[model samples]
Target: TGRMLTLDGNPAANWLNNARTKWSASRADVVLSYQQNNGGWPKNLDYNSVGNGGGGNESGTIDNGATITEMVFLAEVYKSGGNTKYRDAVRKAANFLVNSQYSTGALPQFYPLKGGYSDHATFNDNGMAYALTVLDFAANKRAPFDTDVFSDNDRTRFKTAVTKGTDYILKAQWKQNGVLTVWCAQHGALDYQPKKARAYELESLSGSESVGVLAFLMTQPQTAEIEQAVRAGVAWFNSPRTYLEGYTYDSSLAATNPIVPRAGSKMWYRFYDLNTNRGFFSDRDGSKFYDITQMSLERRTGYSWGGNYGTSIINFAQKVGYL
Candidate 1:
């Protein structure tokens, strides 16, 4: 048995109103939580928030990169709805990012407490790059909708920050044996391993990086250097080693063992496992693997449920005249 609950107002409008309300209430605190002077947002909210998890509820901090993404989305929402509240939220987040830059010009993963902590940035380069890109976008009037967020003064400041940030990123690009291979996620940091040297490898190229670069270029306009970087990036994706047929474990290149077995599967399993380093060449066990392949193809390409990421990329490319 369940108690009856009544909802007033248009259901869709009510949902939207609730979302806006909640976002507004938490917006200011979230900004302060990430501010450098306030000691940065907690790595994990559960631990950081009072009356929540243990260890003073302040273990994990907010990922600066993730906060940047949220800022861009909020900026878009603000532009679309003519809401100054959203604009304020984006501005505060941007302020936190701009203020958190390291002396070396590279942004740290988070504000490490005294006595050296283990909170490190991801090994991939996309994190800082993405944040910079978001900052660039927020400082411009070229978002999806029209808005007055980017005044002349704002534009100048933004351009300066972007130039500095891009310079930092270019310096971090990992070039080995004359091959521009990969980029590290953070600068002025130690590698994951003690004795292992840090360098860029081909595996660092990722869809997230592509999307970020694309967005940045969209606003900044392209140059020869930018084009070269873009080409190098695109070449990596086109490389046989990086291309895979399906989604696999985040760390593994192989399709089976940890994942649902392909032997009894009924689709073309191209998923790669980055962790275990394995992939399914073909349905070795037969059974449903082949049938699964057919079903997967249909579902992925069908009108009802086609590939969302692929479609998004294609649309973006077309808009830029790539298609």
Candidate 2:
């Protein structure tokens, strides 16, 4: 792929609404046209995202749950547009998502469309978390994909996948000092070991992805495992390890979270080195780690260097009695 650029685009969902655009059902047509021959959509934001098994912004992806978004948007279109074809597209993507999951229950960024690191399982932007979430909604026959739209078997399949998928999230979490912490952007499929995605995305205790993972876990049943994950993740959020302390929060980090005071007056670092468990910053070269000042100006200023992503997690964990 042409230098794959993956951000936990978390870039993307309160499960996209049915009609918020001027595009309407036509947007649905553009999205469907982009679907790969096998079943899913590409990573591009251009609703007309298509990939040629090559690389570019549009290569088929699961990174940040890019492909699954189409299934969601299509569901809304089918319901509103009253088109069977849109309904069929949802079926295809739904099946593709369920089938694409690893037996270990983790979902990778790419579904083997074109080869690349896009194949890594990403928690960045809550990739699999979002996948499981959409599956849960579909299984219950919620909005967009109506109850009648999916057969009983399909609903059962989706629910079953959600169970397995959430377990995988617990398994893949990054452990520090023999204790579960946050998650890395990408993990090796075979080993469930921390791995890197695109440049700048290293194998670290990702602050942003951790927030997404914890948030998703909070939605799940309060099993011992879920409680432990939430507790540990919340601890990380409240500690100094999750942030740079004094730096200001950046856009990519602050955009998804609206509850932050003054856009996170007390910024947070997006990555934590797996070894040290401290704030981590890397350059575009992605080779070495240095202080933020060492990075080129564009990278230092452009990428998400900080944000208080865990405030909501802290509050939720407390509310749920996990704290």
Candidate 3:
């Protein structure tokens, strides 16, 4: 393919010239402003991490990729838009990640410089891996922040951090009996043992988080260990033990809502009890196993109970015969 040379003769050229754009400046400003003096963002943007505000303000976090999301956005805008403000924010944001890892090399969700539970190395929404992935992008030579704004030192450190953090995740897969299955939403930073997050989030292997973890991990270099891990992870997901034949939304029925016909499909439950090894569901108030139907309609409809965590995994696994 040749590069477009004429902006005047081609309408496509005009669109391609600058179809570019907060997650740029506007979004970046609010998020960057929320950064605590320590470089991390509060769970709630309204409160700075250093404050004692209630709710998510209790700690600085990368929850849902909060801080790192901003870091990536800033790096991107700085690269394309050439704003010194976004550039400066990118360097400062990098500091939070570079400084926040545990000596063992995993990242915790909270930032009191922290934990029993709040300190868990989060894989929920693939939090820690997601942060490192942003660093990986920033470290790329072709990336805007690379060299121009971020130094060689920055690239080296970010890559090093990604390697260390990735290993932490690769090793964090929960073992059932002996084979690798999946990951818990949160793990103890020191030990990588499955730890609790919310009251309803018991120690368990998760399709929700594991799906995200597997997807991100697959993007990294797959060593022999990683290959085996992927093999086993997908194997568990494909097995009857994990992907249950189930019933949910059905279109073929009476008025308001479609009733679930008798069915089971290639889909996974949200959580698998670490001990029972059975798919389970729960509401906000913990301590009991409730089927999707057993929970209130609000809880039932509100939360994710099932998903196809294996479609991509299945493609890869079947192609490579890792299935």
- For candidate 3, write residues 1-323 as lDDT tens digits: 12112123222222112222323345545555666666667763432233332222335678865776666666667776677877776786677787888766688887765556668788876577667666766666534455377888888998898888878887788888876788888888889899877867778888777765665566566677886787778788778766656545343331232224346546666688887778776767775574555665655655566566666556655654456
Candidate 2, 4: how far from true, in Å?
38
Residues 132-173, model 2: lDDT tens digits: 777877786767667357999999998888888787788888
**Candidate 3 residue spans exceeding 4 A from truth:** 1-26, 44-59, 113-116, 142-144, 246-265, 296-298, 316-322
lDDT by residue (tens digit), candidate 1, 272-317: 2223222222222221222233333323232111111222333344
User: Backbone collision count in every prediction?
Assistant: 29, 6, 2
RMSD of candidate 2 to the true fold? 7.6
Q: Which candidate has the highest lDDT of all?
A: 2
Sorted on lDDT, best first, the list reads 2, 3, 1
Question: Which candidate tops TM-score?
Answer: 2
lDDT at residue 237 of model 1 (Cα atoms): 38
lDDT of 1: 0.41
Runs in model 2 deviating more than 4 A are 1-23, 48-59, 113-115, 250-264, 318-321
TM-scores for the candidates: 0.52, 0.82, 0.79
Question: What is the Cα-based TM-score of model 3?
Answer: 0.79
RMSD of each: 13.2, 7.6, 8.0
